């Protein structure tokens, strides 16, 4: 695709990679952040769906764990596939905007910059924090983003355009954990979901029929005395199963980590803790601008529950506003697209010329 110089936007997640063209309203490509390599022989590699389909003869790996890159060779495969297979461009022809997790280690920010310029020869690049890009997509400069995906959840307070690092909280509880949990409780119901192929099925049950109850105990009750909340689901083979209270207990783990045997605070209290770490004078603006973002925030009912739980933690007079855009699965990507399209962005990129003068550490001065 390409105004004058066409910029590209890559949003790399633990579970999914979202990639496209600056100026589009949505990612052109969305695929699993998976790299498959031969168990024995052909060097060779596979990415995404195709790696999954040949899993039986490949060793599969996730280069991003909890939002942080832990395998750079495999990350480079994701990137090479993104450019040549998914977007069909030559990277040396485009400025590339990439995204990162809050608190990304210094060394990792240097390495991304290094790979882009030295392995792909991008003429220009930029790295942006995911949460800040979602805040921008929602037309705000101050607010608190609750970002929950496949491997990690973060609560990121932002003021006048920048994250407040000291108040950011990380929660290793996200979509994967939820899928696994739905597997275990559907199993306990009498069904049996334990295999890789079954995991996939459950991920889909989770995405199609799960929901957050506004009142967990009242709902366990309704479910126990009625059959009204039940739903049927068709497995790939034609068999029909019945899902009941599992629909809402699964995402309840977001608000009650003890359900997963975890000792931490749930998303509502983590959001509250981040707000209380910020200057008392901006708290009103955080509470009134709680932006939900990421695939794990797509459960029906989650906004209403976040509203209820935050309203209970904060002084009754405090105005609470939960913003949960219908497109929040791609908010990070959309923010990146808007930012990279601005007439005033030209100046913000790290150019090849800057990179050749300072090396990878230029990233700590150019991208904050």
């Amino acid at each position: 695709d390409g105004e004058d110089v066409q910029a590209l936007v890559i949003d790399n997640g633990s579970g999914m990679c979202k990639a496209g063209f600056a100026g589009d309203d949505a990612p052109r490509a969305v695929f699993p952040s998976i790299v498959g390599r031969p168990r024995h022989t052909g060097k060779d590699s596979y990415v995404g769906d195709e790696a999954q389909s040949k899993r039986g003869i490949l060793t599969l790996k996730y280069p991003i764990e909890h939002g942080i890159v832990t395998n750079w060779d495999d990350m480079e495969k994701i990137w090479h596939h993104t450019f040549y297979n998914e977007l069909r461009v030559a990277p040396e022809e485009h400025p590339v905007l990439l995204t990162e997790a809050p608190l990304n280690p210094k060394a990792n920010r240097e390495k991304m910059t290094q790979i882009m310029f030295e392995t792909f020869n991008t003429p220009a690049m930029y790295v942006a924090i995911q949460a800040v890009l979602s805040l921008y997509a929602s037309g705000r400069t101050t607010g608190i983003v609750m970002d929950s995906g496949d491997g990690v959840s973060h609560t990121v307070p932002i003021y006048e355009g920048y994250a407040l690092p000291h108040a950011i909280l990380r929660l290793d509880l996200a979509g994967r954990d939820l899928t696994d949990y739905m597997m275990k409780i559907l199993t306990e119901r009498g069904y049996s979901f334990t295999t890789t192929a079954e995991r996939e099925i459950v991920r889909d049950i989770k995405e199609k029929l799960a929901y957050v109850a506004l009142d967990f105990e009242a709902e366990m009750q309704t479910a126990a005395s009625s059959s009204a909340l039940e739903k049927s689901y068709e497995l790939p083979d034609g068999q029909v199963i019945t899902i009941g209270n599992e629909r809402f207990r699964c995402p309840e783990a977001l608000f009650q980590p003890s359900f997963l045997g975890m000792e931490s605070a749930g998303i509502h209290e983590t959001t509250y803790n981040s707000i209380m770490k910020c200057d008392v004078d901006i708290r009103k603006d955080l509470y009134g601008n709680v932006v939900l973002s990421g695939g794990t925030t797509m459960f029906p009912g989650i906004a209403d529950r976040m509203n209820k739980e935050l309203t209970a933690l904060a002084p009754s007079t405090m105005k609470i506003k939960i913003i949960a855009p219908p497109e929040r699965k791609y908010s990070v990507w959309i923010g990146g697209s808007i930012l990279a399209s601005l007439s005033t962005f030209q100046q913000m990129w790290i150019s090849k010329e800057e990179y050749d003068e300072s090396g990878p550490s230029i990233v700590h001065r150019k991208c904050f």
């Binding site: 100026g23 400069t141 007439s343």
Partner: protein
């Protein structure tokens, strides 16, 4: 080595006491003709800079980004970002404010002595 906006409009911003208004137009910051100040297209997003003169010789800055009921996502996201960039350019001295159609702060409404007016329509989305 630097990240300085060279957009002509940044050079004109906050030089003197007064009101400056720009409209987001297809990913760009574009001046509003001063005879049109106060007539806001509800299909658009805008950026307003109020510069007040201080005793000290320096200027006080209040940056407001106004969001119309029908503005597209690229427009509201760009107004917000342009606001951050203008504040930065001005050394972080602007105080930022989000203004939503129908819910504007009194200070913001107070800038338009003959009363702010809404009008339907506006420029097409940059997407």
């Amino acid at each position: 080595m630097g990240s300085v906006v060279e957009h002509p409009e940044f050079l004109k911003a906050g030089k003197e006491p007064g009101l400056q208004i720009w409209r987001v137009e297809k990913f760009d910051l574009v001046p509003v003709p001063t005879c049109l100040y106060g007539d806001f297209f509800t299909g658009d997003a805008y950026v307003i800079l109020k510069t007040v003169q201080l005793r000290n010789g320096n200027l006080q800055y209040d940056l407001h980004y106004w969001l119309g009921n029908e503005c597209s996502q690229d427009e509201s996201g760009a107004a917000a970002i342009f606001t951050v960039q203008l504040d930065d350019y001005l050394n972080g001295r602007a105080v930022q404010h989000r203004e939503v159609q129908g819910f504007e702060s009194a200070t913001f409404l107070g800038y338009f002595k003959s009363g702010l007016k809404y009008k339907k329509g506006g420029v097409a989305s940059g997407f």
